[PDB]
Design a protein around this motif. Structure first.
Motif, PDB file in Angstrom:
ATOM      1  N   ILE A   1       0.853  -1.226   0.000  1.00 32.89           N
ATOM      2  CA  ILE A   1       0.000   0.000   0.000  1.00 32.89           C
ATOM      3  C   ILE A   1       0.880   1.264   0.000  1.00 32.89           C
ATOM      4  N   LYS A   2       2.195   1.110  -0.010  1.00 34.62           N
ATOM      5  CA  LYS A   2       3.168   2.223   0.152  1.00 34.62           C
ATOM      6  C   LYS A   2       2.810   3.389  -0.778  1.00 34.62           C
ATOM      7  N   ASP A   3       2.743   4.609  -0.245  1.00 37.25           N
ATOM      8  CA  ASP A   3       2.535   5.851  -1.036  1.00 37.25           C
ATOM      9  C   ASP A   3       1.196   5.811  -1.772  1.00 37.25           C
ATOM     10  N   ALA A   4       0.229   5.016  -1.341  1.00 40.32           N
ATOM     11  CA  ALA A   4      -1.117   5.037  -1.961  1.00 40.32           C
ATOM     12  C   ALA A   4      -1.680   6.461  -1.814  1.00 40.32           C
ATOM     13  N   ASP A   5      -2.344   6.970  -2.852  1.00 40.37           N
ATOM     14  CA  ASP A   5      -3.033   8.289  -2.804  1.00 40.37           C
ATOM     15  C   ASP A   5      -4.375   8.163  -2.090  1.00 40.37           C
ATOM     16  N   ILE A   6      -5.004   7.006  -2.242  1.00 40.80           N
ATOM     17  CA  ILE A   6      -6.381   6.684  -1.801  1.00 40.80           C
ATOM     18  C   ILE A   6      -6.338   5.342  -1.077  1.00 40.80           C
ATOM     19  N   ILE A   7      -7.026   5.284   0.043  1.00 44.18           N
ATOM     20  CA  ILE A   7      -7.226   4.048   0.833  1.00 44.18           C
ATOM     21  C   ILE A   7      -8.730   3.910   0.976  1.00 44.18           C
TER      22      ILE A   7
END
Ligand SMILES: NC(=O)c1ccc[n+]([C@@H]2O[C@H](COP(=O)([O-])OP(=O)(O)OC[C@H]3O[C@@H](n4cnc5c(N)ncnc54)[C@H](O)[C@@H]3O)[C@@H](O)[C@H]2O)c1
Ligand SMILES: Nc1nc(-c2ccc(F)c(F)c2)cs1
Ligand SMILES: Nc1nc(-c2ccc(F)c(F)c2)cs1
Ligand SMILES: Nc1nc(-c2ccc(F)c(F)c2)cs1
Ligand SMILES: Nc1nc(-c2ccc(F)c(F)c2)cs1
Ligand code: NA
Lengths: 312, 311, 311, 312
Positions: D66-72
């Motif tokens: 999930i590293k540096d995801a813009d959206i979760i």
């Protein structure tokens, strides 16, 4: 336009969803199980409101509600559970397909019918036998899935978009599958030119053909459930080609009438879909390509005959 | 994402429209004529509101407003009218493209640049010479439009959808154009199998190639205006391939250096587009295919030289 | 489904384009001027191939090609020149609309008809009078344009998306326009709550209403051409509501039949569109709101009578 | 753009599907169960090829992806079945949300986070407490779903499209819900004008409010599964508002700080979403409207405190 989903399970719901996104028609979600299609219809109505879609949606347990449907999608049947032979599955889904065939004849005999229930090669032939519908107005969705997998894997290896990778694959799923490298192209350029330029090897193509044959079982092994999104997308493309008279080209189970040394059987083949239905076309195979296809055809013939017997 | 349209004529406005529908980015509509981009920007804002699109649109007469654009589309130019070849236009369009090239170098030197001004292959070479932008960040839209005409006509004759009819067309417009029947397919099936099945004749294919070469002049003759919708769609496809890193495959004017016996020239060729630009690829041509291509390349070479002298 | 464009100028071509993108039907591009619809049909076929649309497109100068059309869009008419009075424009476009009305009755009497020719409030009435078509199967596109502009401007001031800004605007363009602040809302919240919170002033709303009245002339003054993209989007929304039986809500010219103290006239009003046509509904206006509307209606009545006499 | 789905169940997969159709970004499908996200990723890749979409899809069991995801989007939880309240679980879902909160803080602390897990308003407060993300970068999807049901039902009764029916609904699901008739409109026209014209009665509106409160449980009772399509659509609308800086207007669970008399708590309220996150706004409520909201807020306050204890 009235689109009737016979079976409101995972695939039927997603076909409904994609028909709404894509504005193809009003939906009838039909199932035998009380409440399932009513619940899914509510969910898809709320989905429609959020996404700006304005089509009518009915969930129903009453088969008469499919009356005058333009489109029938049949996912009705069960999954084979522990204690069940392949022969028990054929008997249960074949009895269901016979009953659906009779209801379509009674209520919506002018429908274009897309058969999806497994095993697909058999269940499309069962539908034709008991429906008394014209062969042009019946097809089975299969080949598009195999083609999509093969083309996406070729595109991944060449580091290109899949949008312009096209291929002909004849026959059914798994061992029934007959892919044609000669009829595989990348924006018009034959696959063989990429082999010539060492951008892909014949060994890589064989490996991709094996992953294609095994893909359905691989998804079942990983997700503990059969593919649902891609089957739904393939079904929605076939619906759209019929409704908008598109003459789009597909491999789907289609009635052969002399084509590829075969008549009086539905088999995975080259077809186009327009508002008169699904029409085979024959291309020139080599002797080895035609021998492999004839072997695929003989297996479908043999299994279909066994299935009619298993249905009494 | 910032998409800068240098030219707010028919093609630029429709590129803006298609970028808003596809949600690709905020627009800058630039033109030399006071008021035109402002008025078209107002129209496209009201269009956006009716269709539920949320992107910003600025119309401007200040070319520095292209600053840090991700995408440049250049339609600044004059078009050809009926009685005129594409190639006549070189003198005034050359000076225009040079001035645009200088502004892009100043204000958005990291933009992906799609040149559309005629004559197309010449004006791409002019843009490169005076911008000094990296070769892979510059292209011209032509081959997608020619390909769309040829594939539409083949699909009509075979009574099939055009969605899975694909072809490679090398070189420029008109006599410069080299369509390859051997790299034409219908859902993977080579064109030659349709000839073999007598679903289309070699004479019908030649007639379709002639209609393809002459299509631009035929539209000008009938509509009293050059094509706008199909050029715009072709440009929008190339934009989307760059922005979404898609590696979609196109014939477009691209820098060849060694490919197809061509040194140091932008010409219509096989390429893919991703977020690092346009990357040519070379396929095995026949001797007759390569002779026809070399002839088209020699004409672009000769006209590009003429253009640099006129400028 | 067959969509006939009577008029293949800027708005008709863009309506064609948006009908192809939305996959609403096959097109017939009709015009009196030889070659124009043929050229634009070629362009839209090429556009279709690039974007993966598979509908038939026919460009024609033969009015009988509109036979059994499901949809008619009428933009047939001229632009007003400086010498040309409002009366001259009414005379020329009135005679054209009478002729189109007769052709629709002869060739496609089951069509849903969307009138777009200037002046809009007159020309819809002219079509009805000479068509012998049912009033439910006729409408005129105007209110949606004014609503889109007013809602865009309110959204800009409140720093919100326009997607959920809605308003009722009755009557026609310019002085004919009757906007209802009481029937303006931001995702359900009345406009007046934003005034109460000092997010917008009554002066700002009046200024937005004046910019809305003048927007048409502002685009004409900047772009040296009348709006085309937004009118086309408004027309395509109305087409989609009819074809897909959507009961979407619009202010469009619709036949009033006792509504708002008016019968036997097409006027901009609150309506819904479904596969049976365009149906007015009446809402409770205050006396001042209804007096303003009645004054707008009297002007349309007066101008329509003048037009029938000129014709 | 990188969109991380924490939870690869029915809602997460359909959010993935809708993000691919809308071309919003590359997807990471994460789940704790080996193979499920890998299988669904394969399905969504094949779906993408058939529909002409080009985005990357990774299915993974490794949270560091999930590293540096813009959206979760967080759907990790267990769901309620029929005979269960929303509030029943809540020790297991609370521990799951705590662990996710820790992962997001470690791997992608700049993400915009949309919480979906099942006691919705509580699990948003749990995510904030253990993530320490900025308040405006955290929200919960609920109000759009309730609004879609209420607007659908009003549109059905008036025989109008739902496209231009809009309403404010404050608070959570079920008894937590406070719909505002005064902030309901049909293409600008207040609901009260429809009552005045006898196109809908106050009793019909009350019945619509009751169906809205009970809709989650109704779908569970009929479909033997919780709603999936409409939740996914509501999530995708919120994602799109953030990614494209749209300032679209929603009711979602959002951090209030004085708004509607609420201090330091995430609760269903009026907000806009842009690329800086979710920003609450206060409108004037009557005393009766505010008393109902304060009651909903006090229940969320009470249950959030209880949930932190159940988490120890
Ligand atoms: N053709 C292909 O390439 C392909 C790909 C994957 C799956 N499939 C097949 O598609 C079928 C459906 O898959 P799914 O995931 O949607 O299954 P599912 O079990 O989710 O849904 C099937 C639905 O049919 C209903 N049904 C059962 N008996 C019925 C009857 N008599 N009349 C009507 N409805 C009845 C069930 O209640 C259920 O809701 C299966 O047979 C599966 O093997 C085919
Ligand atoms: N009738 C016609 N069908 C085709 C065609 C059909 C299906 C295919 F799968 C194909 F590859 C070509 C070409 S012409
Ligand atoms: N780099 C690569 N380019 C291609 C390709 C490019 C352009 C074409 F027009 C084409 F057909 C293939 C395939 S791999
Ligand atoms: N014919 C009918 N219209 C409405 C309605 C119509 C138009 C509008 F513009 C509106 F704002 C409400 C409700 S029923
Ligand atoms: N900043 C602003 N927010 C709003 C608003 C937000 C959310 C809503 F749900 C709404 F109905 C209005 C209007 S202006
Ligand atoms: Na760039």
């Amino acid at each position: 336009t009235k689109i009737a989903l016979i079976g409101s399970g995972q695939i039927g719901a997603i076909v409904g969803e994609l028909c709404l996104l894509e504005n193809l028609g009003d939906l009838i979600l039909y199932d035998v199980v009380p409440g399932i299609p009513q619940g899914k219809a509510l969910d898809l109505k709320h989905f429609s409101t959020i996404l700006g879609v304005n089509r009518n949606i009915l969930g129903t347990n009453q088969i008469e509600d499919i009356k005058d449907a333009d489109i029938i999608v049949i996912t009705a049947g069960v999954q084979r559970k522990e204690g069940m032979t392949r022969e028990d599955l054929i008997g249960v889904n074949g009895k269901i397909m016979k009953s659906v065939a009779e209801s379509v004849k009674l209520h919506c005999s002018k429908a274009f019918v897309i058969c999806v229930s497994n095993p697909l090669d058999i269940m499309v032939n069962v539908f034709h036998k008991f429906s008394n519908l014209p062969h042009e107005k019946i097809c089975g969705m299969a080949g598009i899935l195999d083609t999509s997998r093969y083309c996406s894997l070729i595109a991944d290896k060449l580091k290109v978009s899949a949008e312009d990778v096209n291929a002909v694959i004849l026959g059914g799923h798994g061992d029934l599958m007959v892919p044609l490298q000669r009829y595989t192209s990348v924006n018009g350029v034959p696959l063989s030119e990429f082999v010539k330029k060492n951008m892909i090897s014949q060994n890589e193509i064989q490996e991709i053909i094996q992953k294609t044959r095994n893909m359905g079982a691989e998804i079942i092994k990983l997700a503990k459930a059969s593919a649902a999104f891609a089957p739904a997308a393939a079904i929605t493309k076939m619906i759209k080609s019929y409704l908008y008279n598109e003459n789009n080209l597909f491999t789907c189970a289609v009635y052969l009438n002399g084509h590829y040394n075969c008549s009086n059987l539905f088999v995975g083949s080259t077809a186009k879909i327009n508002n008169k239905g699904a029409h085979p076309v024959e291309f020139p195979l080599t002797k080895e390509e035609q021998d492999l296809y004839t072997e695929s055809i003989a297996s479908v013939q043999s299994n279909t005959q066994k299935a009619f017997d298993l249905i009494k």
